[PDB]
Amino acid sequence: SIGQMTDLIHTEKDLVTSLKDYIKAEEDKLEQIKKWAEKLDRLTSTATKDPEGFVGHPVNAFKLMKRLNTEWSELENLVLKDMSDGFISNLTIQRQYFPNDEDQVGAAKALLRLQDTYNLDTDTISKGNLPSFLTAEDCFELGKVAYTEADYYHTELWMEQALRQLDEGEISTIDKVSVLDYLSYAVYQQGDLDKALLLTKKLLELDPEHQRANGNLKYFEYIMAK
Amino acid sequence: SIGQMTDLIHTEKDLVTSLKDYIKAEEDKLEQIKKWAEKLDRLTSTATKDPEGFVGHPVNAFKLMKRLNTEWSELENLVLKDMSDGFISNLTIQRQYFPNDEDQVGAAKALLRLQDTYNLDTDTISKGNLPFLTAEDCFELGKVAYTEADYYHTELWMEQALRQLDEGEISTIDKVSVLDYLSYAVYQQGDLDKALLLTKKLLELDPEHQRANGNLKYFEYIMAK
Secondary structure: OOHHHHHHHHHHHHHHHHHHHHHHHHHHHHHHHHHHHHHHHHHHHHHHHOHHHHOOOOHHHHHHHHHHHHHHHHHHHHHHOOOOHHHHHHHHHHHHHOOOHHHHHHHHHHHHHHHHHOOOOOHHHHOOOOOOOOOHHHHHHHHHHHHHOOOHHHHHHHHHHHHHHHHHOOOOOOOHHHHHHHHHHHHHHHOOHHHHHHHHHHHHHHOOOOHHHHHHHHHHHHHHHO | OHHHHHHHHHHHHHHHHHHHHHHHHHHHHHHHHHHHHHHHHHHHHHHHHOHHHHOOOOHHHHHHHHHHHHHHHHHHHHHHOOOOHHHHHHHHHHHHHOOOHHHHHHHHHHHHHHHHHOOOOHHHHHOOOOOOOOHHHHHHHHHHHHHOOOHHHHHHHHHHHHHHHHOOOOOOOOHHHHHHHHHHHHHHHOOHHHHHHHHHHHHHHOOOOHHHHHHHHHHHHHHHO
């Protein structure tokens, strides 16, 4: 539907309003804690300076003990206090009407097809180079969904975009070796052994003991030879 | 001992260091969260302008789903994260060498003793006008006295607490409770003129205080008698 998307756009907006509320909360806590800490900073720096004289006049001694017995306990209680209940409460509730895995993969598939029905370069989708933009792990996931479909066409394309972006300098949760594993395997399944070999060799240049890739190399030079 | 307190002073110095670290931790986390939030502030606002055209080109639909299914739960996980174990472990360990309630009460008594062995005015001990206590500190000392049945000191420190309140100090402690204790201590001391006086002012602040009405009637009774 479209109304569903407008409904989810709106949910996620309200959720951002909630989030920002929570941020006001944690800042307000954190600050009065900073205030508290500077107060003790002042006290504890002047007290370290002259422990005999400080502990001398017992207005200091009483303050020191009311502070260690009571104050540091309130303080501790406040550090432990939780500011996020409200926001998390909301989120837990909204999550009743969120998409699940099924819908995420559905949406990947949909993207996959709309790539080649309007016939588009993956750098031309990722980078919004047409008249929002895609992390390396996004491309990576697309390559995976594809690979699970044994769709090596798309696996090739997105694993390639994913490799391209990591090279370009995008810092990520995803490493080159996985990218190269899936890339080299999709390529091999395509028919072009010749590139599979080199890619595998890049993987090996990154991970010399990648147990799968060595076996892959042996296999490769074997089926080329034969 | 003196060295024992030197060890304590240093311990608390250390704890302040720990806490300051904790603050750096929560701030760092919060920052990453504000970051995430602003990125989504953009996305949501763009999307609301024209939901149709937006969910039109389905990279938008994909990201919207990935973000509702995966990413908001990582965000959730960040929100729930606890930056405090380091500091709280430090605290829970040091606590083994902290004073307890009895030590604190004890110190309050040591202070009451000092007040009079050097014969010193309360504003003067509080305001460190020698060559500083909050109103709740003052009240506290007052109570320790009271519990002792030391109505002398109860008198004095309830007086100082009321003094520091009227000056305009913000405190968790209200004027009426200080007045209750003060009126009563004064009465037990003997100056009944002042007990009446005070009870009256307490009533000026709370007109239906159940103890202090009967306190008014009873005081003027024993005055007249």
